[PDB]
């Protein structure tokens, strides 16, 4: 789904079809470089998504003092310290699932059990 | 005779392709001609719905999940039955069936709406039925020169009123 | 940042002359790929086509209009 | 119906220049084709 660029000239490649050999050949519209396509996938709309509650993590989230602190442990390092905080996505139907990030194992883990 | 040969060839293919081999090939083509002659009994190749039921039964056979439909259709579950069945949701397989019932339960719950529940007490008395089942609720309406309104409603019958 | 830079260029003996820089200039290639024309560009920009052809530049190059500078030379 | 993933396969039939036509036709069939019911009516719920 990514947008490849011509390695000779950093420009947006377009799909264009072979006339007889029946293969998608990503030909550069700037220069004459051409490349065959790995998959027949071209375009993808994705009218439904549910993604974005997790990321935005820096390696020193816990360096900020404003996050609360708890005593549930990380289930890799068993250290009782932790930093917990809710979703990073904000829609009107995002969940009250929680995200728990530790300093020792430096790992992200949740509290869902379905 | 295009349809009455094509569907017969289709059942030739979907019965020879089985792990259940046809040494009783005459029995199996008897099964096929019985299937086709009850199949036409809905339409006789004169109704457009003929191909739909054929697609249903054909792709149910070729589904896999499940393959056991071939075994049960060769060892029973007769073909004039399986025009009048229309049991496409009912068959092939049962895990998908209970998946469908869970889906239907979920949809039937989620189509239900808002049901704010109106906590009651016995402090006041209704005007219509004069019962102490007051669906009371409290809120402020007027200017700064007064406290709240003392909104009232009876939940036993539906009688809304107000206290002074 | 043309003010703060200064030059350490080694010489043949190993000498390091200090040349205080004055300006810095940036160069890009241009017309390496048979660039188009503003007028027909405006006609493609206008809503004559709901979507312009993907290989329209390839068709124009096959026509030979506005070829490369190397090809013209 | 009974497959694990319901699929539609469609093609343009006519006896270069495919992508944008097919994208627009895709957009059109998504935006216009009614299924059942009557338009300008939205979600519906049941009270007891
Ligand atoms: Zn290129
Ligand atoms: Zn841990
Ligand atoms: Zn009452």
Swiss-Prot record, chain C:
<comment type="function">
    <text>TFIIF is a general transcription initiation factor that binds to RNA polymerase II. Its functions include the recruitment of RNA polymerase II to the promoter bound DNA-TBP-TFIIB complex, decreasing the affinity of RNA polymerase II for non-specific DNA, allowing for the subsequent recruitment of TFIIE and TFIIH, and facilitating RNA polymerase II elongation.</text>
</comment>
<comment type="subunit">
    <text>TFIIF is composed of three different subunits: TFG1/RAP74, TFG2/RAP30 and TAF14.</text>
</comment>
<comment type="similarity">
    <text>Belongs to the TFIIF alpha subunit family.</text>
</comment>
<protein>
    <recommendedName>
        <fullName>Transcription initiation factor IIF subunit alpha</fullName>
    </recommendedName>
</protein>
């Amino acid at each position: 789904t990514t947008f490849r660029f011509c390695r000779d000239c950093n420009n947006m490649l377009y799909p264009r079809e072979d006339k007889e050999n029946n293969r998608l050949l990503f030909e550069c519209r700037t220069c004459s470089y051409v490349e065959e396509a790995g998959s027949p996938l071209v375009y993808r709309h994705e009218l439904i998504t549910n993604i974005g509650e997790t990321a935005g993590v820096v390696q020193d989230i816990g360096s900020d003092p404003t996050l609360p602190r708890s005593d549930r442990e990380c289930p890799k390092c068993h250290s009782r310290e932790n930093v917990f905080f809710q979703s990073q996505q904000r829609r009107k139907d995002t969940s009250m699932v929680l995200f728990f990030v530790c300093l020792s194992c430096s790992h992200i883990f949740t509290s869902d059990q379905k | 005779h295009k349809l009455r040969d094509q569907v017969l060839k289709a059942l030739y293919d979907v019965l020879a392709k089985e792990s259940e081999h046809p040494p009783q090939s005459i029995l199996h083509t008897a099964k096929a001609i019985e299937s086709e002659m009850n199949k036409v009994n809905n339409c006789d190749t004169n109704e457009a719905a003929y191909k739909a039921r054929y697609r249903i039964i054909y792709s149910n056979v070729i589904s896999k999940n499940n393959p056991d439909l071939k075994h049960k259709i060769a060892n029973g579950d007769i073909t004039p039955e399986f025009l009048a069945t229309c049991d496409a949701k009912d068959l092939a397989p049962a895990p998908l069936k209970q998946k469908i019932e869970e889906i239907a339960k979920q949809n039937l719950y989620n189509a239900q709406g808002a049901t704010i529940e109106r906590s009651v007490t016995d402090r006041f008395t209704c005007g219509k039925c004069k019962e102490k089942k007051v669906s009371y609720y409290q809120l402020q309406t007027r200017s700064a020169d007064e406290p709240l309104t003392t909104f009232c409603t009876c939940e036993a019958c539906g009688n809304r009123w107000k206290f002074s | 940042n043309s003010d703060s830079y200064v030059l350490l260029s080694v010489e043949d003996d190993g000498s390091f002359t200090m040349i205080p820089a004055d300006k810095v200039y940036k160069f890009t290639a241009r017309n390496k790929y048979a660039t188009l024309t503003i007028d027909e560009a405006e006609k493609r920009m206008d809503k004559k086509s709901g979507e312009v052809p993907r290989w329209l530049m390839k068709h124009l190059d096959n026509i030979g209009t506005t070829t490369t500078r190397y090809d013209r030379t | 119906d009974n497959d694990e993933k319901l699929i539609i396969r469609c093609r343009v039939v006519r006896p270069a220049e495919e992508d944008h036509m097919l994208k627009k036709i895709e957009n059109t069939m998504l935006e216009n084709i009614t299924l059942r019911g009557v338009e300008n009516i939205e979600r519906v719920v049941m009270m007891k």
